[PDB]
Amino acid sequence: VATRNSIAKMIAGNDTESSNTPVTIEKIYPYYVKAPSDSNSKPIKQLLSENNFMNITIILFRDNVTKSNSEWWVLNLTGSRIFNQGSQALELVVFND
Ligand SMILES: *[C@@H]1O[C@H](CO)[C@@H](O)[C@H](O)[C@H]1NC(C)=O
């Protein structure tokens, strides 16, 4: 309920005080996914179980320097940094078959 309330306040941003903070959700985004030769791909729970703390941050970016209402979303995976740190980005480890 807290995450839903926060994202509601953000998408209906009318305060210019809040909505500048990325809202975090837990237990969402796996890291290690195997892509077999078939159609089905499998998120490996052996190498990393999805029952642990997995952070995913969100925030709605917008601006008027474009002189228009052209907004978009942006995600972030800053906790548990991997090589090529590059804050405010995502990374997926895939096991090809
Ligand atoms: C923003 O919209 C919500 C929708 O009800 C309202 O509760 C809130 O008071 C509004 N805030 C401002 C600053 O307009």
From Swiss-Prot:
Expression tissues: Expressed in bladder, colon, and lung, but less abundant in kidney or skin. Strong expression is observed in dorsal root ganglia (DRG) sensory neurons. Expressed in a wide range of cutaneous low-threshold mechanoreceptors (LTMRs), including Merkel cells and Meissner's corpuscles. Expressed in sensory neurons. Expressed in cochlear inner and outer hair cells and vestibular organ hair cells. Expressed in pulmonary neuroepithelial cell bodies. Expressed in bladder urothelium and sensory neurons of the lower urinary tract.
Phenotype of gene-disrupted mutants: Perinatal lethality. Pups show signs of respiratory distress, such as cyanosis and gasping and also failed to suckle and die within 24h of birth. Conditional knockout in sensory neurons and Merkel cells causes severe defects in light-touch sensation, although detection of pain (nociception) is unaffected. Conditional knockout in inner ear hair cells show no auditory and vestibular defects. Conditional knockout in sensory neurons leads to lower body weight, primarily due to a reduction in fat mas with reduced mobility and similar food intake.
Residues bearing attached sugar chains per UniProt: 64
Subcellular location: Cell membrane
Remarks, miscellaneous: Piezo comes from the Greek 'piesi' meaning pressure.
Assembly, per entry: Homotrimer; the homotrimer forms a propeller-shaped Piezo channel with a cation-ion conducting pore. Heterotrimeric interaction may occur between PIEZO1 and PIEZO2. Interacts with STOM13. Interacts with TMC7; the interaction inhibits PIEZO2-conducted mechanically activated currents. Interacts with TMC1; the interaction may be part of the MET complex. Interacts with MDFIC (via C-terminus); the interaction prolongs Piezo channel inactivation. Interacts with MDFI (via C-terminus); the interaction prolongs Piezo channel inactivation.
Function of the molecule: Pore-forming subunit of the mechanosensitive non-specific cation Piezo channel required for rapidly adapting mechanically activated (MA) currents and has a key role in sensing touch and tactile pain. Piezo channels are homotrimeric three-blade propeller-shaped structures that utilize a cap-motion and plug-and-latch mechanism to gate their ion-conducting pathways. Expressed in sensory neurons, is essential for diverse physiological processes, including respiratory control, systemic metabolism, urinary function, and proprioception.
Protein family: Belongs to the PIEZO (TC 1.A.75) family.
Protein name: Piezo-type mechanosensitive ion channel component 2
Organism: Mus musculus (Mouse)
